[PDB]
């Protein structure tokens, strides 16, 4: 029954999910446009932790000393301190991170940090660290302007929808917002310079591979996602005070006015 | 809110026994069920009562009655569904069939 209901659902070349009639089921597949096989569980580091831990992990101040950075972390560590343009860049990066923290707490009420997202940033960071032989003692060659601008350009380069109008662009931003939150959480100035200690070429390689892997994770038009979903729901049922298992699945699919255990939850 | 509650119910059924299914599959199911403005049963009195083509409707349930009703109403089946092209024995507009391959004379000359 499930397969027959969903047998005509397909991902089309405008990334919309449509049936045989052309009716739009989802305006983008899975609300993110990503192939399920290219999804891995990753940790959103902005949502978790405390305010003090979040500031220590992300906040960088070039004027005061409470959240200052070690000048030995990067090459021009003594010239950046006291700078105003780079301070403006840091200010907007941290403001964006705070906005992302608030957004992610809004999306997930329980504060769950490990969620399935397409591109594993951690593995790319580790591969870059091993490929470029980070010695973790030499000051980093990166400039902070490079970090901020590279992150912004990478975000601009993650394309799910290729249209050139306001509707398609807004849909693209909505489709990539969660992955962009993950990317900003991982590739932050303090984390890049201190925890990971990237170099210039290592950072650029990380950006290039993140872009390539994200473009590879996009669902391929022509994918018969309806049959895939029907099978992915029916097959786990074959392994199966409130009704559960097969009877509840049938009460859900067979929309029955009266069910065995009608329970209401009051908070 | 009905679609959200439906997704929560289906997710609870799947995840009651510890199994995990990606969000997009259950989301597609619940979106299909709630795309008509109301809860559409996966039963014959819901998804097969949709004007999605007589041939793909008859393959599920009440085949002959569907054919008779389609003949009475002179329905046009545009052969966009998978079951239509399966019945007619032609390449469905799915997967490899979701596009047309065509030969370019200019590129063929350009190679040599």
């Amino acid at each position: 029954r499930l397969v027959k209901a969903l047998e005509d659902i397909m991902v089309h070349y405008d990334n919309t999910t449509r049936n045989s009639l052309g009716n739009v089921i989802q305006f983008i597949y899975g609300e993110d446009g990503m192939d399920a096989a290219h999804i891995e569980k990753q940790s959103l580091d902005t949502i978790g932790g405390s305010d003090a831990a979040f500031e220590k992990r992300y906040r960088v101040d070039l004027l005061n000393t409470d959240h200052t950075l070690d000048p030995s972390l990067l090459e021009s560590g003594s010239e950046i301190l006291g700078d105003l343009k780079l301070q403006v860049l840091l200010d907007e990066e941290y403001k964006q991170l705070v906005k992302d923290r608030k957004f992610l707490r809004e999306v997930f009420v329980d504060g769950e940090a490990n969620w399935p997202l397409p591109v594993n940033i951690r593995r790319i960071i580790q591969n870059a660290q091993q490929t470029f032989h980070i010695d973790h003692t030499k000051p980093s060659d990166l400039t902070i302007k490079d970090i901020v601008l590279g992150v912004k350009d990478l975000q601009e380069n993650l394309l799910v929808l290729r249209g050139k109008n306001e509707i398609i662009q807004n849909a693209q931003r909505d489709a990539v917002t969660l992955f962009c939150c993950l990317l900003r959480s991982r590739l932050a100035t303090r984390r890049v310079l201190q925890e990971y200690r990237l170099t210039k070429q290592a950072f650029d390689w990380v950006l290039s591979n993140i872009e390539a892997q994200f473009l590879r994770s996009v669902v391929h038009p022509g994918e018969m996602v309806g049959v895939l979903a029907a099978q992915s729901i029916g097959e786990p049922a074959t392994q199966m005070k409130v009704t559960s298992g097969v009877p509840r699945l049938k009460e859900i699919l067979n929309v029955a006015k009266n069910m065995k255990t009608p329970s209401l939850t009051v908070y | 809110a009905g679609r959200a509650a439906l997704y929560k119910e289906v997710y609870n059924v799947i995840a009651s026994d510890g199994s995990y299914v990606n969000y997009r599959h259950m989301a597609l199911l619940v979106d299909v069920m709630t795309t008509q403005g109301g809860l559409t049963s996966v039963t014959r009195h819901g998804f097969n009562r949709s004007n999605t083509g007589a041939l793909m409707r008859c393959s599920f349930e009440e085949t002959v009655e569907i054919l008779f009703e389609a003949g009475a109403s002179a329905e046009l089946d545009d052969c966009r569904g998978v079951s239509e092209n399966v019945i007619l024995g032609q390449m469905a507009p799915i997967g490899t069939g979701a596009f047309d391959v065509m030969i370019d004379e200019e590129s063929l000359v350009k190679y040599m």
Binding site: K250, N254, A256 | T43, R44, H45
Partner: peptide, 10 residues
């Protein structure tokens, strides 16, 4: 129901 365990109904 079903069948088995039409519908209901039909």
């Amino acid at each position: 129901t079903x069948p088995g365990v039409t519908x209901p109904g039909v």
